[PDB]
Write a protein that binds this ligand. Structure first.
Ligand SMILES: [Mg+2]
Ligand SMILES: [Mg+2]
Ligand SMILES: [Mg+2]
Ligand SMILES: [Mg+2]
Ligand SMILES: [Mg+2]
Ligand SMILES: [Mg+2]
Ligand SMILES: [Mg+2]
Ligand SMILES: [Mg+2]
Ligand SMILES: [Mg+2]
Ligand SMILES: [Mg+2]
Ligand SMILES: [Mg+2]
Ligand SMILES: [Mg+2]
Ligand SMILES: [Mg+2]
Ligand SMILES: [Mg+2]
Ligand SMILES: [Mg+2]
Ligand SMILES: [Mg+2]
Ligand SMILES: [Mg+2]
Lengths: 150, 80, 129, 205, 82, 123
RNA sequence: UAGCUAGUAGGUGGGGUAACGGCUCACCUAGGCGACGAUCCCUAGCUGGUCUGAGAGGAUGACCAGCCACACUGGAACUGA
RNA sequence: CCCGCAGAAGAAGCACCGGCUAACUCCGUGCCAGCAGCCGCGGUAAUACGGAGGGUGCAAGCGUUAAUCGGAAUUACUGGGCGUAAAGCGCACGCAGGCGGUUUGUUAAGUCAGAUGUGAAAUCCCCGGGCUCAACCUGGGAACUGCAUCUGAUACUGGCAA
């Protein structure tokens, strides 16, 4: 349950006097498979260094998320930059269907029966995140009584 | 009765050639909003009796003219 | 304008709440109250009050639980432009079950839970959670 | 409609044994297995979630000897059926007669078990069934036809069948060469190295 | 007039008739007034193969209705009471 | 925006112009070869591409591509044309079914003979 | 395409049809329809359903069944339930 | 449908392998010949042209074309936008229309409720049954989200009154 996996790696150029100087960007996601998910970014001239430096950032920066069994309690909508995502509990038939790149954060996060889809731009760096928050903002299926009661 | 219609007049200036409005209300079948939708009806009113702006009760009968298949039963109010 | 006052209520909550504001007041109406009622009975507002007579003055006490406010979201649904009327089998349940839906019926402003039991339906004023 | 091609070449690409030469020896070698399905066999298949998603359902196919069209319906049926799509696919695939013929020993390899079926040397509850696809249900009673019995093949077939993990959901003879499919196999029997939700995923998008 | 007939809803070589009450002038497999049984001539000697709401049939015949020749049989063949 | 607004003038769907007046959506169409040119392509590329201008069974006069390495096709040749533009050759929006009517299969092709219309060479 | 309408809209009476009826006629009234889109123009048989879509929708109306219309084109009637 | 007879005997092709995309090398060619769904390949080491060996995918089919919907939240009712990306009429008044503060009464059209009728059969779906399996055939439910009539409910909307 270490369980990590990268979503996307990408070249990017910097351009100076002597020429273009390229780099790489890794975008990873780690989770315990039981709550607690996090993503990190981190970039570096070589690829290994990049994916590497990324897991590390995803070690920290790892929030956790009030599941409700293998699934979500209620349906939720997340939205960062131009990414706008939606996912549903979906009383598992089998489920876990969703655009790879949030399959990733859903998978390692423990949910086992989501159906989701991403609207807006499908820029990973922003849907992962749009969903992390999406799961984050999602509130306690019991400790909403907590909220109310009094 | 078998059903009744309501509706205001709109035209009485014609020899029992009275025409009656029938304002219903209805959910737009695509955009949800409710809209006004009128139904003018050429109705028979023997001895021309109601006037424009009289609310009235109406009932479906057999044909009396290419255009008339209804006749009045009651009036309800006047001067608008 | 003042044309929809219920959205104005919904929003005075919504706003003051995000302003961490203790109370909040507004011109009252029969309607307004019957709702605040439900808000209270279901524990979203702290307690209301109508300090008026000729120029009535509905006044509400907002609650804050942890650090948050108790009202994570308050939207209008029906509105004078476009009125919504769901039957009963069609009554909408918010946040799965958590949170509520304020609905007016042939017998008073209730909650979707309540209305569902009542066995009836009506104009679904707004959603709260 | 039957693959027909160098059976072993498949297992080497899919990276495991799919018991297609099944026959005698085991844990291949005396074959070549692994590091050259082709000519650039050495090369490391670093591959898309698509690649691995594909190759898995491919692997399962190269086993039961099914072609895309049927397999596609098998999946389409699974889904229709209540209860886990990915498991259900595995149910259907097992209930296959050809399968419940090698899974009873009567045949060396599923490929051969099938050859029997097509040659009407098998019967269900009495009656000669000669189509591989024949779904077998619980309580059924598949048995070699008296005509052509304890014939060459079916001997060693019944034989090294015992050298197999040997099932549970079905009760075989060896004298009668009859055998009772007792229950629809559970997820837990069979499997281990086969990944449904992948191939379910393949047919999901 | 109104007849009760077979209406071969079957399948090439493996027939299967909807017995129906209809307007005798319409197509055999067309417009009818109501269904009132069926008759599977390949039934096989297992269980079923000639259900036949006798109470309706008798109703229409009291209304005037006439009856086929192969329906005729089926009736005096479902014996009638047992 | 407004519901009111949408109500008066509802939303409408942009209609799609086909890119291939193979008139009434036809898998292909017949034609007689008006003239059998060859021109050269657009900015990046550089070549002598073989084409022909065809008068169609339905009277559209349209230019089409003659795929392959070499082709015995001339004026008055009766050919068959299919959807298939050639981006390189602006305004060339159809291809010519090698091996149909008067058109020939490509000589000596071994690969992808179904395309380019060649018979299974007597093995 | 912004106006359209003289049997036009209604009344009375005769005639008429298996029947109600401007169906028709004579006379009287001056009506009737129309931006909730008439008139004009373009296109088209309608349905059950069919394909697709998570749905909402979109697209569609072979094969089956229902209704309608047509029978070389235009027009007419006779017979007959 | 059953029984015998002979001999593996009469029975495998099509597209693809630069990326998207499952599958890589050699030879030829040299901005030519040519490819191409989109990006783009070809000017001497071309995994993109053409042939060859190998491989991947389908299989009595395989490819290409044409065609609807899908992915397209890209006409956004569900479900979008207009400062600088497409988009606020140069500004104002104002008919129709849309929307309208607050109390009470009344009305009961909208809205809501139950009852009843109707919503053909086939189809679709659910559980079975019959053809060696299946396609196919078939029993029975379910569904037809609709319409209409009656009776009720009065909070909201509309009508009336003050
Ligand atoms: Mg086949
Ligand atoms: Mg018989
Ligand atoms: Mg008269
Ligand atoms: Mg969609
Ligand atoms: Mg026909
Ligand atoms: Mg004629
Ligand atoms: Mg006559
Ligand atoms: Mg690859
Ligand atoms: Mg090619
Ligand atoms: Mg070279
Ligand atoms: Mg769309
Ligand atoms: Mg936009
Ligand atoms: Mg601009
Ligand atoms: Mg009010
Ligand atoms: Mg039906
Ligand atoms: Mg069966
Ligand atoms: Mg009121």
């Amino acid at each position: 349950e270490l369980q990590e996996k990268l979503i996307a790696v990408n070249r990017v150029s910097k351009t100076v006097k002597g020429g273009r100087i390229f780099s790489f960007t890794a975008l990873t996601v780690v989770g315990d498979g039981n709550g607690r998910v996090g993503f990190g970014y981190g970039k570096a001239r070589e690829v290994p260094a990049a994916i590497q430096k990324a897991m590390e950032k995803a070690r920290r920066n790892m929030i956790n998320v009030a599941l409700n069994n293998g699934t979500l309690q209620h349906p939720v909508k997340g939205v960062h930059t131009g990414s706008r995502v939606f996912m549903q509990p979906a009383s598992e038939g089998t489920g876990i269907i969703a655009g790879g790149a949030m399959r990733a954060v859903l998978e390692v996060a423990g949910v086992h029966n989501v159906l989701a889809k991403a609207y807006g731009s499908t820029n990973p760096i922003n849907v992962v995140r749009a969903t992390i928050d999406g799961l984050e903002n999602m509130n306690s299926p019991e400790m909403v009584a907590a909220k109310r009661g009094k | 009765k078998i059903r009744t219609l309501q509706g205001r007049v709109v035209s009485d200036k014609m020899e029992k050639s009275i025409v009656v409005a029938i304002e219903r209300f209805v959910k737009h079948p695509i955009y949800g909003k409710f809209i006004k939708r009128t139904t003018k009806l050429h109705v028979h009113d023997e001895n021309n009796e109601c006037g424009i702006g009289d609310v009235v009760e109406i009932r479906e009968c057999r044909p009396l003219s290419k255009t008339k298949s209804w006749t009045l039963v009651r009036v309800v109010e006047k001067a608008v | 304008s003042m044309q929809d006052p219920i959205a104005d209520m919904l929003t005075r909550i919504r706003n003051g709440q995000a302003a961490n504001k203790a109370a909040v007041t507004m011109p009252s109406s029969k309607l307004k109250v019957a709702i605040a009622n439900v808000l209270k009975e279901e524990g979203f507002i702290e307690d209301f009050k109508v300090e008026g007579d000729t120029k009535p003055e509905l006044e509400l006490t907002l609650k804050y639980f942890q650090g948050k406010a108790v009202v994570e979201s308050i939207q209008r649904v029906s509105r004078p432009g476009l009125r919504i009327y769901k039957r009963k089998d069609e009554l909408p349940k918010v946040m799965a079950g958590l949170g509520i839906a304020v609905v007016s019926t042939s017998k008073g402003v209730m909650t979707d839970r309540a209305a569902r039991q009542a066995g009836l339906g009506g104009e679904i004023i707004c959603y709260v959670a | 409609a039957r693959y027909l091609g160098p059976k072993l070449k498949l297992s080497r690409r899919e990276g495991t044994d799919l018991f297609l030469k099944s026959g005698v020896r085991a844990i291949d070698t005396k074959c070549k297995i692994e590091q050259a399905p082709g000519q650039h066999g050495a090369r490391k298949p670093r591959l898309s979630d698509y690649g691995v998603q594909l190759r898995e359902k491919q692997k399962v196919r190269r086993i039961y000897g099914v072609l895309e069209r049927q397999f596609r319906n098998y999946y389409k049926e699974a889904a229709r059926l209540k209860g886990n799509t990915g498991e259900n696919l595995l149910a259907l695939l097992e209930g296959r007669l050809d399968n419940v013929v090698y899974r009873m020993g009567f045949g060396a390899t599923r490929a051969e078990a099938r050859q029997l079926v097509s040659h009407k040397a098998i019967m269900v509850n009495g009656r000669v069934v000669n189509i591989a696809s024949y779904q077998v249900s619980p309580n059924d009673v598949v048995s070699i036809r008296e005509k052509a019995k304890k014939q060459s093949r079916v001997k060693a077939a019944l034989e090294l069948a015992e050298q197999r993990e040997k099932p549970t959901w079905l009760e075989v003879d060896a004298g009668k060469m009859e055998g009772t499919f007792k229950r629809k196999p559970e997820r837990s029997d069979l499997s281990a190295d086969i990944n449904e939700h992948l191939i379910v995923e393949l047919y999901s998008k | 007039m109104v007849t009760i007939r077979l209406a071969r809803h079957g399948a090439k070589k493996r027939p299967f008739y909807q017995v129906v009450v209809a307007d005798s002038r319409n197509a055999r497999n067309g417009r009818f007034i109501e269904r009132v049984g069926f008759f599977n001539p390949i039934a096989s000697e297992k269980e079923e193969g000639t259900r036949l709401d006798l109470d309706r049939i008798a109703h229409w015949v009291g209304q005037g209705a006439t009856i086929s020749d192969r329906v005729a049989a089926l009736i005096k063949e479902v014996n009638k009471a047992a | 925006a407004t519901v009111n607004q949408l109500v008066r003038k509802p939303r409408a769907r942009k209609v799609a112009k086909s890119n291939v007046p193979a008139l009434e959506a036809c898998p292909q169409k017949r034609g007689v070869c008006t003239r059998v040119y060859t021109t050269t392509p657009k900015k990046p590329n550089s070549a002598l591409r073989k084409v022909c201008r065809v008068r169609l069974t339905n009277g559209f006069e349209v230019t089409s591509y003659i795929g392959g390495e070499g082709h015995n096709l001339q004026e008055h040749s009766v050919i068959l044309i299919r959807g298939g533009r050639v981006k390189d050759l602006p305004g060339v929006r159809y291809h010519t079914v090698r091996g149909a009517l008067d058109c020939s299969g490509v000589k000596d092709r071994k690969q992808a003979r179904s395309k380019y219309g060649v018979k299974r060479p007597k093995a």
